[PDB]
Amino acid sequence: NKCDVVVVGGGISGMAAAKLLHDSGLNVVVLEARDRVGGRTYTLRNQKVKYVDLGGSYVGPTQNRILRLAKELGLETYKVNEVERLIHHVKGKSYPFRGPFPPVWNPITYLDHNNFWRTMDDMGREIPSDAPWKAPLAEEWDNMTMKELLDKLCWTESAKQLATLFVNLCVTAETHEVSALWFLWYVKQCGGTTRIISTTNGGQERKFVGGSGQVSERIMDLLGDRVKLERPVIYIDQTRENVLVETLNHEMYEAKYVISAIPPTLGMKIHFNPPLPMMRNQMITRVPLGSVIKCIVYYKEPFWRKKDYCGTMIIDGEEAPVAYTLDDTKPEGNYAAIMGFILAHKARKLARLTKEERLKKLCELYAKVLGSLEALEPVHYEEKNWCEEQYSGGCYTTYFPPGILTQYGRVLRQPVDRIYFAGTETATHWSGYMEGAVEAGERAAREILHAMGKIPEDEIWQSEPESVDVPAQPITTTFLERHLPSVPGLLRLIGLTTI
Amino acid sequence: NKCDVVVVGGGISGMAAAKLLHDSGLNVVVLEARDRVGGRTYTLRNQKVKYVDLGGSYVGPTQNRILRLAKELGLETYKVNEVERLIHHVKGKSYPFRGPFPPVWNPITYLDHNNFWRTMDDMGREIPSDAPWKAPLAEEWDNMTMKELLDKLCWTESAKQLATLFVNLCVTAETHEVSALWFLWYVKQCGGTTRIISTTNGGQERKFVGGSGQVSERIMDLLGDRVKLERPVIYIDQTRENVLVETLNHEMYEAKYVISAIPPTLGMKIHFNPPLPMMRNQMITRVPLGSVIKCIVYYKEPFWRKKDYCGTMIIDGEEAPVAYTLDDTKPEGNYAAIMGFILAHKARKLARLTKEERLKKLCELYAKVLGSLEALEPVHYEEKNWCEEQYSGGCYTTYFPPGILTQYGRVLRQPVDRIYFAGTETATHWSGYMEGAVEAGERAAREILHAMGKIPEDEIWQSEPESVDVPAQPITTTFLERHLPSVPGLLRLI
Ligand SMILES: *[C]C1=C([C])[C]=C2C(=[C]1)N([C][C]([O])[C]([O])[C]([O])[C]OP([O])(=O)OP([O])(=O)O[C][C]1O[C](N3[C]=NC4=C3N=[C]N=C4[N])[C]([O])[C]1[O])C1=NC(=O)[N]C(=O)C1=N2[C]([O])[C][N]C(=O)C1=[C][C]=C(Cl)[C]=[C]1
Numbered sequence: 001n002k003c004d005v006v007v008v009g010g011g012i013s014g015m016a017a018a019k020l021l022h023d024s025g026l027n028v029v030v031l032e033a034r035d036r037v038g039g040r041t042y043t044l045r046n047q048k049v050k051y052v053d054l055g056g057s058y059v060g061p062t063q064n065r066i067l068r069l070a071k072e073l074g075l076e077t078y079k080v081n082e083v084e085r086l087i088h089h090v091k092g093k094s095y096p097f098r099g100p101f102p103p104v105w106n107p108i109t110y111l112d113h114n115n116f117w118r119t120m121d122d123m124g125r126e127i128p129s130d131a132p133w134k135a136p137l138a139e140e141w142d143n144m145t146m147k148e149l150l151d152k153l154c155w156t157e158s159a160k161q162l163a164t165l166f167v168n169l170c171v172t173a174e175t176h177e178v179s180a181l182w183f184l185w186y187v188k189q190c191g192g193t194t195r196i197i198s199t200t201n202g203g204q205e206r207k208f209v210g211g212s213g214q215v216s217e218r219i220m221d222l223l224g225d226r227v228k229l230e231r232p233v234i235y236i237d238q239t240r241e242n243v244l245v246e247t248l249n250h251e252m253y254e255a256k257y258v259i260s261a262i263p264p265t266l267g268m269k270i271h272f273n274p275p276l277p278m279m280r281n282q283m284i285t286r287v288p289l290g291s292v293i294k295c296i297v298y299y300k301e302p303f304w305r306k307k308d309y310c311g312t313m314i315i316d317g318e319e320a321p322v323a324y325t326l327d328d329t330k331p332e333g334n335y336a337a338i339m340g341f342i343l344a345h346k347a348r349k350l351a352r353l354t355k356e357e358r359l360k361k362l363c364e365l366y367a368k369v370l371g372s373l374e375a376l377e378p379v380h381y382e383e384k385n386w387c388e389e390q391y392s393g394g395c396y397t398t399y400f401p402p403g404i405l406t407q408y409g410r411v412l413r414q415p416v417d418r419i420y421f422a423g424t425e426t427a428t429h430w431s432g433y434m435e436g437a438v439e440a441g442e443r444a445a446r447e448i449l450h451a452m453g454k455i456p457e458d459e460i461w462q463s464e465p466e467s468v469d470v471p472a473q474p475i476t477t478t479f480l481e482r483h484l485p486s487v488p489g490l491l492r493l494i495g496l497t498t499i
Numbered sequence: 500n501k502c503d504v505v506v507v508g509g510g511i512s513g514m515a516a517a518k519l520l521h522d523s524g525l526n527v528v529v530l531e532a533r534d535r536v537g538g539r540t541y542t543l544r545n546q547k548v549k550y551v552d553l554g555g556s557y558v559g560p561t562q563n564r565i566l567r568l569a570k571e572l573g574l575e576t577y578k579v580n581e582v583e584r585l586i587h588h589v590k591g592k593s594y595p596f597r598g599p600f601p602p603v604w605n606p607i608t609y610l611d612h613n614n615f616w617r618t619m620d621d622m623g624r625e626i627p628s629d630a631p632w633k634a635p636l637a638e639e640w641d642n643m644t645m646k647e648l649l650d651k652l653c654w655t656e657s658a659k660q661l662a663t664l665f666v667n668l669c670v671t672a673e674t675h676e677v678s679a680l681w682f683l684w685y686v687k688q689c690g691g692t693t694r695i696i697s698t699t700n701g702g703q704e705r706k707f708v709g710g711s712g713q714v715s716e717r718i719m720d721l722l723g724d725r726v727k728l729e730r731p732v733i734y735i736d737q738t739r740e741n742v743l744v745e746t747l748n749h750e751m752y753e754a755k756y757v758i759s760a761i762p763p764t765l766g767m768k769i770h771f772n773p774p775l776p777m778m779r780n781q782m783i784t785r786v787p788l789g790s791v792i793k794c795i796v797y798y799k800e801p802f803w804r805k806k807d808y809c810g811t812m813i814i815d816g817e818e819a820p821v822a823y824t825l826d827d828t829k830p831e832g833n834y835a836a837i838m839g840f841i842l843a844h845k846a847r848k849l850a851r852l853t854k855e856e857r858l859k860k861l862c863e864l865y866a867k868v869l870g871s872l873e874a875l876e877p878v879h880y881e882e883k884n885w886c887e888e889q890y891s892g893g894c895y896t897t898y899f900p901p902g903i904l905t906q907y908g909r910v911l912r913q914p915v916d917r918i919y920f921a922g923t924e925t926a927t928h929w930s931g932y933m934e935g936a937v938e939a940g941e942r943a944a945r946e947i948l949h950a951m952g953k954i955p956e957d958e959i960w961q962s963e964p965e966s967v968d969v970p971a972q973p974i975t976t977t978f979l980e981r982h983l984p985s986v987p988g989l990l991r992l993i
């Protein structure tokens with residue numbers, strides 16, 4: 001029944017919020033819909049895989065909050081394999097390369113590719129992390145899909161193809177589904193294009209030893225019986241002195257404050273009294289999550305390494321079920337595995353098939369891309385379709401269709417009386433990641449601490465010391481990369497000498 | 500507890516479904532979240548207005564199902580006033596006109612305006628009413644916003660302005676918010692541009708005497724205690740022999756079948772066991788409703804008539820709070836009133852103001868457009884912001900953002916085990932209107948009748964005889980309108 005704060009949702013954001021409040025002396029209860037904690041992170045354990053992340057998995061430099069929390073919980077990280085060559089598969093042929101970016105040899109194509117990535121970052125510099133709708137051209141950029149932006153910027157099909165894959169991979173949505181403003185904000189708040197796509201020195205550098213699901217499981221261990229599993233919240237009442245929170249199985253909880261630590265659209269599953277303010281009421285119907293199937297194919301050995309391939313494949317084309325892979329072998333060199341994402345509309349299309357049918361398609365693709373018959377001999381297969389999850393709605397995160405961020409964005413983390421909002425979608429740095437979940441959870445908790453007169457307003461948004469274990473190298477640009485003209489810029493330079 | 504069918508939602512769709520099933524001999528229960536029936540229709544009664552529709556209101560020719568249902572319930576219609584001239588207000592000036600369409604005098608602009616409306620209808624002819632995702636260019640048109648389509652088609656700012664207002668008014672959403680495929684489907688399934696925008700011979704021809712809320716109230720009268728008010732459904736369980744439906748106030752209902760007669764996205768308010776199939780699970784997060792405030796300003800007399808204005812105003816520009824008005828005077832000539840819509844992003848912007856502040860803005864606008872100081876002296880004001888409604892989500896209807904209709908559209912009225920789907924959003928003719936609500940409700944009811952072996956498959960989709968009271972004139976095009984070139988067509992000819 002009675003406590004200081006009810007946290008709705010037991011993912012990383014909710015658990016982190018509850019941990020901070022618990023550590024401050026407050027009585028907290030976490031209400032979780034599922035029979036487990038972790039939400040969009042899920043570690044499966046069986047004898048064939050030992051452990052495997054079927055949801056959120058990768059951490060990297062600049063993600064200092066998730067690194068600190070996990071370290072405090074006694075977790076270790078290890079480096080994702082990027083010793084050997086990456087592969088870019090384009091028009092049925094594989095091109096091995098090193099470094100973060102696939103190489104381009106055609107000089108026109110090179111100018112186009114260089115200008116695209118640069119423009120994304122240039123446009124991002126105009127967007128405040130904490131308030132994207134305050135960008136000078138906010139409305140113009142928000143009334144545009146990423147597809148429209150790509151059509152205007154990319155003068156070659158090759159750049160357009162790669163930019164499209166980039167959008168699909170970062171936000172599990174089609175370029176035509178998402179707002180240009182939102183996507184440009186999304187990349188900037190992760191530290192830019194290079195940081196977001198990189199393994200070494202980027203978002204995919206590392207995983208947790210034993211899986212990322214341990215983050216939530218271990219906070220549950222600290223909180224004990226304060227975490228209530230299989231308690232989906234159906235009803236929040238704010239008309240009286242104390243807030244009343246009801247669950248599906250008819251339990252009632254009373255608190256001074258509530259943290260909502262669920263994806264914004266899943267707020268729709270709760271009936272509110274009094275009704276939500278108009279803007280939030282409509283916002284939560286306008287913010288879907290992306291579509292993805294995460295698939296892991298297991299092999300006897302990491303045979304791609306013998307061919308000097310790290311296991312990273314960037315795969316172009318409509319025919320390919322998977323557009324991106326990474327080596328998912330354990331740090332000890334055993335349980336050899338390839339992790340692949342089936343993205344956006346392909347997740348929808350290929351969900352109709354059986355498990356066995358999807359395994360076949362993947363093996364045949366990997367055999368092609370890696371040039372190895374060994375890819376046709378899997379020892380085990382695991383997969384998870386996040387689109388089917390009632391209490392997630394999809395993965396990785398919430399995307400904003402055109403027109404929404406400028407109209408409703410302000411409302412995302414605006415408190416509704418005594419309900420405060422966490423969840424990775426409300427973060428300002430690495431929103432959509434486990435990092436952002438920690439940021440939002442701890443910020444929401446501190447908003448409540450301020451409301452109770454326990455901390456000054458100054459202390460609601462706290463910065464994070466850099467990790468000593470996972471330090472960040474700065475992102476550099478060459479002189480050529482900064483000053484080489486665009487395609488239309490080169491063409492303008494031709495029309496001027498001819499006068 | 501026990502019955503044959505639980506209907507979730509007591510709007511027109513739910514009530515119509517329940518009526519049909521009840522008339523067939525089945526035991527039905529309607530579970531309604533609000534303390535009233537009618538949903539997106541709501542008639543307010545007080546001494547100052549007598550009655551006024553604050554939600555769905557207009558009916559017209561080709562809407563034969565809502566007309567028949569209402570007639571059976573003992574309702575009458577009357578004609579919306581369109582005797583005098585319409586007004587097009589453009590760049591701070593009023594242009595009186597007659598007929599459905601605002602006149603254009605510049606020849607280049609004329610060609611551009613003609614080509615736009617014609618193209619909309621040409622494109623619509625390629626889209627099947629019952630399956631828009633089966634259009635030959637479905638994916639291409641679905642991956643585009645209406646804003647993109649307008650940018651490509653309209654060579655003049657004048658056509659683009661009017662096309663934009665048209666989109667805002669039909670679907671209470673911005674051109675950049677909506678899929679081109681979905682919007683072109685939407686217009687076609689209402690019978691085309693002319694049918695959808697017309698008062699005389701169109702969707703806005705008539706209202707019900709006493710209000711449209713009587714449709715739902717009177718079906719509730721017929722059903723008696725079978726309608727349960729303030730019973731929001733929170734939980735549907737399909738794992739056992741009979742379907743279990745739970746409400747917020749802890750009541751349990753058992754049935755063989757369920758009709759979901761709520762806006763698709765409001766399905767999110769229900770927890771399902773087992774979980775929904777993947778496609779429906781994601782669909783219901785991708786389908787928002789538009790934004791609108793309906794406002795009615797009352798006057799001593801319908802003074803605009805003395806100036807030979809019917810009361811219809813089509814008002815261009817960002818500054819104008821209201822883009823469209825109609826005469827809302829009672830058929831007897833009293834309770835003089837102007838109905839206006841505050842659309843899309845303007846609903847959001849102007850919701851921050853007080854009631855009195857909105858009234859002032861409207862009166863000053865109407866004074867400008869109608870050219871009368873009499874507009875500055877309102878006797879009464881009524882309004883409703885549909886954006887704030889927990890159990891509606893907005894108004895008039897569900898719109899589809901780019902990419903959604905081709906990916907998830909198939910799933911809209913696909914049965915989930917023993918749950919069947921009604922609601923105006925699942926209709927194939929006048930979806931988004933009271934007409935479509937009737938179509939969908941009765942179709943969903945018949946799907947269940949077929950599932951029980953009571954009717955043949957042949958009988959699930961029934962056609963409707965034309966109303967003798969409100970007959971439809973056909974939509975005609977002149978030779979010139981059909982064959983006059985576009986702007987780029989004229990330039991190609993040069
Ligand atoms: C799914 C996914 C996947 C597959 C993958 C991934 C991901 C995902 N990610 C993301 C993450 O995971 C997230 O963000 C997190 O987790 C979040 O958290 P939060 O905020 O907390 O949320 P959640 O989890 O969801 O939780 C919630 C909770 O609550 C609950 N509920 C609901 N409802 C309700 C409830 N309760 C009561 N009542 C009611 N009503 C639920 O149940 C839950 O529990 C990510 N992340 C990171 O960090 N990393 C990673 O890795 C990840 N992932 C991916 O990988 C990503 N990727 C990307 O992006 C990329 C790649 C590559 C390149 Cl080159 C670039 C980019």
Ligand SMILES: *[C]C1=C([C])[C]=C2C(=[C]1)N([C][C]([O])[C]([O])[C]([O])[C]OP([O])(=O)OP([O])(=O)O[C][C]1O[C](N3[C]=NC4=C3N=[C]N=C4[N])[C]([O])[C]1[O])C1=NC(=O)[N]C(=O)C1=N2[C]([O])[C][N]C(=O)C1=[C][C]=C(Cl)[C]=[C]1
Pocket residue numbers: 507508509510511512513530531532533535536537538539540553554555556557558668669670695696697702703730731732733760761762765768769791792793823885890891893894895896921922923924931932933934936
């Ligand atoms: C709002 C609105 C307005 C303002 C206006 C209008 C409208 C609207 N409309 C539409 C109609 O109204 C609709 O469609 C109908 O109503 C629908 O129905 P349904 O389908 O049945 O649905 P609803 O109503 O919503 O119902 C539902 C129910 O359910 C319930 N719930 C929820 N949730 C729940 C429940 N329960 C239990 N549980 C749970 N969970 C609720 O509560 C409800 O009750 C329209 N219509 C027609 O027909 N007409 C008209 O008039 C209308 N309106 C407008 O006016 C339109 N306009 C247009 O569009 C235009 C104008 C001008 C031109 Cl030129 C063109 C166009």
